[PDB]
């Protein structure tokens, strides 16, 4: 889906 | 702008592509469909309809009504063929222009079973037994009942049920055959013989015609769309 850093 | 990288195929026009494009007449009020009879969903539906074979393409009979008539007579029994035909449904000249043959000439490959139905058009008083044969390829094409008997066949008894059908079952090495004359994908031999002879009483015509029809079975299919040679436009 989406990774977030 | 979003970083993009143009790939090969960019800006080409492939005539078989399937893309969206802008509508030149936006918000156009389309006329609704009505339920017209006779809708077709697949070209093979048309191939499953019997159409009549131009069996006799002799120099004088071809391109006339006579080409569809196979003449029989009450002559003494012979083991010689009434007709001989190659199972090359798109390319043999007798099959290539039937509705089946015509649809096959828009495709490169065909597969499946076929069927030949013969109609006896003699008088009610005329009787007879005929042998309809299919020989799969690879041996000498049958020129005598003795050989034709050994292959797939139907012995037709003439009577109230006017017509008789022989099914040519899908028997092939390849999964699809070519729609042109090709030895590797050859289909074999269709032929008809006198099993006994046509017999008539007195006061009766001694010669008569049979008509023949070909159509596809429900297991029949075609593929690789192509242009036909059956129409052109020189100049």
């Amino acid at each position: 889906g989406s990774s977030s850093t | 702008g979003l970083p993009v990288m143009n790939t090969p195929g960019s800006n080409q026009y492939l005539t078989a592509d399937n893309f969206q494009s802008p509508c030149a007449l936006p918000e156009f009020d389309v006329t609704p469909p009505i339920d017209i009879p006779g809708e077709v969903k697949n070209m093979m539906e048309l191939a499953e309809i019997d159409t009549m074979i131009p069996f006799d393409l002799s120099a004088t009979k071809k391109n006339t009504m006579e080409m569809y008539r196979v003449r029989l007579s009450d002559k003494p029994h012979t083991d010689d063929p009434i007709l001989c035909l190659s199972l090359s449904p798109a390319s043999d000249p007798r099959l290539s222009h039937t509705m089946l043959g015509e649809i096959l000439n828009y495709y490169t490959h065909w597969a499946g079973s076929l069927k030949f139905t013969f109609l006896f058009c003699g008088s009610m008083m005329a009787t007879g037994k005929l042998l309809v044969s299919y020989a799969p390829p690879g041996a000498d094409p049958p020129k005598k009942r003795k050989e034709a008997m050994l292959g797939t066949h139907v012995i037709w008894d003439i009577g109230l049920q006017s017509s008789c059908t022989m099914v040519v079952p899908w028997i092939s090495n390849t999964t699809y055959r070519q729609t042109i004359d090709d030895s590797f994908t050859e289909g074999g031999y269709i032929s008809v013989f006198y099993q006994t002879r046509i017999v008539v009483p007195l006061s009766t015509p001694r010669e008569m015609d049979i008509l023949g029809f070909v159509s596809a079975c429900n297991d029949f299919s075609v593929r690789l769309l192509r242009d036909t040679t059956h129409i052109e436009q020189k100049a």
């Binding site: - | 090969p8 080409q12 078989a16 690789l224 052109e232």
Partner: protein
């Protein structure tokens, strides 16, 4: 579940041996290769193996476009005595040698085919006239369909044949085609004939070429310059690149060791000595 990019097996440490187990002794008559690993015949240390066979999977080995042909076309002045050249090519991977040799490591294959087209043009006469940008038509004419006889005849209508209209100087054209064989796999080798010679038939009538199946296996590509004749003549070339995507192969074969000589396995006299001199006891 073992994938092409998985690491190969670790070396396990192994020590001295003195037993009736004889890994080193074998018998190749059986037709088998002895499955040995270094720890079978020498002392080994433990090594954690990271290398993989990812680049030698069948897909990766073939995952490259190879040139299979060069088609020549032109567009001359209208006044020429010679006809405008359009090209006709029978589709095959056997007009060039490199992809052919790679596919022929195997007897049979299945794949989807990607064709990419590189198009280049030039002037020929030491003129000073110009030519406006050319559009090319690459038409696939499958076995049975009318092959073009003139650069401008009715067949180029393409109502049913697939065609690519390529614009010069744009990205090279590209299309994909499914596995289109009439068999369950492509045969790289066919030990047979397309006809049985019968006794009751003349020899000419029963004859056919060795190893050839359908005369027109896959049809042809016909290419033309769509632009009308121009005062200054331009000649163009269409290079065709074939890539087998989504590929499966069966029955391995020794690779071609002497020069190709025709579409079959035939060889030419004078090309049969690939190997060079080297002395038995010379490193």
């Amino acid at each position: 579940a073992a994938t092409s990019r998985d690491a190969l097996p670790n070396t396990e440490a192994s020590g001295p041996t003195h037993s009736k187990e004889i890994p080193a002794l074998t018998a190749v008559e059986t037709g088998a290769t002895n499955p040995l690993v270094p720890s079978d015949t020498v002392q080994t240390r433990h090594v954690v193996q990271h290398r993989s066979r990812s680049e030698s999977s069948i897909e990766s080995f073939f995952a490259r476009g190879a040139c299979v042909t060069i088609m020549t076309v032109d567009n001359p002045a209208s006044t020429t005595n010679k006809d405008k050249l359009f090209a006709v090519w029978k589709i095959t991977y056997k007009d060039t040698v490199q992809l052919r040799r790679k596919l022929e490591f195997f007897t049979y294959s299945r794949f989807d085919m990607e064709l990419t087209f590189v198009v280049t043009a030039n002037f020929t006469e030491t003129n000073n006239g110009h030519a406006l940008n050319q559009v090319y038509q690459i038409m696939y004419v499958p076995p049975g369909a009318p092959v073009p006889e003139k650069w401008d005849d009715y067949t180029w209508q393409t109502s049913s044949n697939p065609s690519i209209f390529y614009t010069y100087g744009t990205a090279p054209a590209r299309i994909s085609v499914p596995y289109v064989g009439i068999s369950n796999a492509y045969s790289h080798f066919y030990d047979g004939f397309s006809k049985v010679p019968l006794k009751d038939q003349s020899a000419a009538l029963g004859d056919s070429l060795y190893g050839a199946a359908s005369l027109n296996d896959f049809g042809i590509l016909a290419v033309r310059v769509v632009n009308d004749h121009n005062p200054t003549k331009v000649t163009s070339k269409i290079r065709v690149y074939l890539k087998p995507k989504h590929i499966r192969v069966w029955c391995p074969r020794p690779p071609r060791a002497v020069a190709y000589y025709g579409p079959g396995v035939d060889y030419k006299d004078g090309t049969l000595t690939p190997l060079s001199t080297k002395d038995l006891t010379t490193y």
